[PDB]
Design a protein around this ligand. Structure first.
Ligand code: NAG
Ligand code: NAG
Ligand code: NAG
Ligand code: NAG
Ligand code: NAG
Ligand code: NAG
Ligand code: NAG
Ligand code: NAG
Ligand code: NAG
Ligand code: NAG
Ligand code: NAG
Ligand code: NAG
Lengths: 111, 402, 186
């Protein structure tokens, strides 16, 4: 069988006829996260779109950085809502948009 | 002179971004073959140039999605109580009882739009964009244009609407005496938009189709032999000895390089166009939303009052509410009126007569008032002006002196 | 990148024409020369296309800068967030290598304060609306102030115009408007 792009997505075993699906092995890209040469020389390696201090993200698998629940302003954006910054191990967090403010509104109040 | 008005709310669709894609040069040009990679080494720096060119667009898209939306410093929140003088913002405000914080209109908009190749994810999640939009709505509804510059100052909504009427040139008492009708018209307009969208986002759909067609053409171009014996490297390698095979291999390399360069160039042109659209959207967000525009037709047909932003896949949707006059009535006018030998001119408005008596009224609305020295300023004798009619001007102080 | 492109074989035996000419007879050397010239021509075309694409962006930015010169510098601008953040006052241009620097000057309010407000005041059965400003409350008395700055003034007929009657306005308050004529007519 073939698909719209004309790539062979499926084949059939000539012996004991059976339909077999073909999927390419995972290829991706490697990115390096560093806080600067003058600062401590510890990096984190991010593999683009690859499923594996190993932390799984939507962008890819992240090695060398520890996850933290706290939220800060974005720095060195990994992608898909994850920003990783140096604070000694590099930390990956979900970025916070901004401070939360609830303006007091009344029908007879002005400032 | 108009004697009535209608409130109309319209929509504007603007694309701001496109999907980020990157293509590995070596994988596309050459399969997994050591011999093929050796031939490509002569054609130096082409693959690096193409990869850098694609990376530039990839980062520029994330830049584009930032400036249009991220214009607020603090995430504002609407009060739990809903007292906006009869204006109903339920449809556009976020709905808590939903897996995401998207509003009804945003949900409808989302539902309407439907070999070494990698598609990178966008940096901002859709939930973050919805949070930015909700912040903008809350700030505009509560503060006004004050949160645009120098923190947020709470104002009752009716007073803000009165200020906007004062801005467009209509007296503010028109609002206070006609609040219920305006509230009903605004609600009806919002309902009509909700109905209309459910039954098209043509602008946003074209970009997705164009990008998909470009990628499909790239994938199809592999099957062409480009004048060689065959379209697959493996068959060419086995069929012929290396010295004769190398010519077919270099033919294939040249063809695939040409196709890749064509793809990169057209992607660059399309990225430039999307950048222009994103800049226009950012300017509209700055001016129409965080303020009131005096520019004509920039923020919708008619006199502008305010705008409300919404989020759509790879784009932004603006709702412009405007003021439209209606119910025309004919009259007779004069440039000036001179009493006791001195000409009088209107401070603001027109001189108008129904046929027997003379009044002074504002231009955009019919609010006749008696002529008084508080409404006029003298300039000189009757001679200079042409078309100056004869009429009397009442003196307010004289009867009180009696 | 252009300068480095010269030292690539492009499929020929060598990257130097003089080396090719000496080692090979002309009839066979012409093909080797043709490969090199095709490669160099392709590189030159790529360079020209990239330069055109960059020139488009540069001219767009130049047009934006020219618009900012005429509007922010030569006059006062009402377009919000166009010349700086805050209410714009004036700008001063400066020169930079292959560019221009603008020093926007703005006005930003500060030190807010709570107040109570009312759309109109009912006196003698007729509603009074402020000509220009807001009605604010000290908490015991009522004043009229301009919006951007706090400058309380006592309410007078010279500040408020009268239109309609008391009933129509949704939110109205009761106060007294001081008429300057009466004290003088004593
Ligand atoms: C394939 O060959 C094996 C060999 O014994 C046999 O058992 C099997 O039945 C064969 N299947 C088919 C579909 O011919
Ligand atoms: C690294 O940090 C030190 C200390 O702040 C500073 O002196 C130095 O210039 C920095 N180096 C770089 C390359 O930024
Ligand atoms: C990665 O593989 C594991 C093992 O099959 C699977 O459970 C997991 O869902 C995969 N992750 C993704 C993102 O597909
Ligand atoms: C103005 O239009 C509204 C809505 O059509 C209508 O109810 C009203 O009678 C019209 N006239 C005036 C004076 O408001
Ligand atoms: C706003 O409109 C919706 C739908 O028309 C309705 O369910 C809701 O009750 C309205 N809100 C108010 C305050 O009337
Ligand atoms: C014009 O308006 C005045 C003021 O009400 C009225 O007395 C007069 O009859 C009107 N004239 C006509 C022709 O209707
Ligand atoms: C208007 O035009 C008519 C026709 O020429 C003329 O008789 C009349 O005097 C004009 N009125 C004024 C005020 O100019
Ligand atoms: C207006 O009044 C003056 C006063 O003398 C008179 O001369 C003139 O003819 C009058 N014009 C009209 C059109 O009645
Ligand atoms: C004034 O407004 C602020 C809103 O920031 C509120 O916290 C405060 O309680 C208000 N003061 C009074 C006296 O209402
Ligand atoms: C303002 O109110 C205070 C009490 O809150 C009072 O003492 C003061 O006299 C008032 N000032 C004026 C000018 O009314
Ligand atoms: C303001 O809100 C309060 C509480 O809901 C209400 O009692 C009051 O009547 C409202 N004022 C106006 C002018 O609607
Ligand atoms: C204002 O005065 C009138 C007449 O005494 C009274 O009916 C009303 O309740 C008072 N309150 C308001 C609306 O400010």
């Amino acid at each position: 069988g073939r698909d719209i792009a004309d790539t062979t997505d499926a084949v059939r075993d000539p012996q004991t006829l059976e339909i077999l699906d073909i999927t390419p092995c995972s290829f991706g890209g490697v990115s390096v996260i560093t806080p600067g040469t003058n600062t401590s020389n510890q990096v984190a390696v991010l593999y683009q779109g690859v499923n594996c201090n190993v932390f799984q993200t939507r962008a890819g698998c992240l090695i060398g950085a520890e996850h933290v629940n706290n939220s800060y302003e974005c720095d060195i954006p990994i992608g898909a809502g994850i920003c990783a910054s140096y604070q000694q191990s590099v930390i990956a967090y979900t970025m916070s948009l901004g401070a939360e403010n609830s303006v007091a509104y009344s029908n007879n109040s002005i400032a | 002179i108009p004697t009535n008005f209608t409130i109309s709310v319209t929509t504007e669709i603007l694309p701001v971004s496109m999907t980020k894609t990157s293509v590995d040069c070596t994988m596309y040009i050459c399969g997994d073959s050591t011999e093929c990679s050796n031939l490509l080494l002569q054609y130096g720096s082409f693959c690096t140039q193409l990869n850098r060119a694609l990376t530039g667009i990839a980062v520029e898209q994330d830049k584009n999605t930032q400036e249009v939306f991220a214009q607020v410093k603090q995430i504002y929140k609407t009060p739990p109580i809903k007292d906006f003088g009869g204006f109903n913002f339920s449809q556009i405000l976020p709905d808590p009882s939903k897996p995401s914080k998207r509003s009804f209109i945003e949900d409808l908009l989302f539902n309407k739009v439907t070999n070494g190749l990698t598609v990178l994810p966008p940096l901002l999640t859709d939930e973050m964009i919805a949070q930015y939009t909700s912040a903008l709505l809350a700030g505009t509804i509560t503060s006004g244009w004050t949160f645009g510059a120098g923190a947020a100052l709470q104002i009752p909504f009716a007073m803000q609407m009165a200020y906007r009427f004062n801005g467009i040139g209509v007296t503010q008492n028109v609002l206070y005496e006609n609040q219920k009708l305006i509230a009903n018209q605004f609600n009806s307009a919002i309902g009509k938009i909700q109905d209309s969208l459910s039954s098209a986002l043509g602008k946003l759909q074209d970009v997705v189709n164009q990008n998909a067609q470009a990628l499909n053409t790239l994938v199809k171009q592999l099957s062409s032999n480009f004048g060689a014996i065959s379209s697959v490297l493996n068959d060419i390698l086995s069929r012929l000895d290396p010295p004769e095979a190398e010519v077919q291999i270099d033919r294939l390399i040249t063809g695939r390089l040409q196709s890749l360069q064509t793809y990169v160039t057209q992607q660059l042109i399309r990225a430039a166009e999307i950048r222009a659209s994103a800049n226009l959207a950012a300017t509209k967000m700055s001016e129409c939303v965080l303020g009131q525009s005096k520019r004509v037709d920039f923020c919708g047909k008619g006199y502008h009052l305010m705008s409300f932003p919404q989020s759509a896949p790879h784009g932004v949707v603006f709702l412009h509410v405007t003021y439209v006059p209606a119910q025309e009535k004919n009259f007779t006018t004069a440039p000036a009126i001179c009493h006791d030998g001195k000409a009088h001119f209107p401070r603001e408005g027109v001189f108008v007569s129904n046929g027997t008596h003379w009044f002074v009224t504002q231009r955009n609305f019919y609010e006749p008032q008696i002529i008084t020295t508080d409404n006029t300023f003298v300039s000189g004798n009757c001679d200079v002006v042409i078309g100056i009619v004869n009429n009397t001007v009442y003196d307010p102080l004289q009867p009180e002196l009696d």
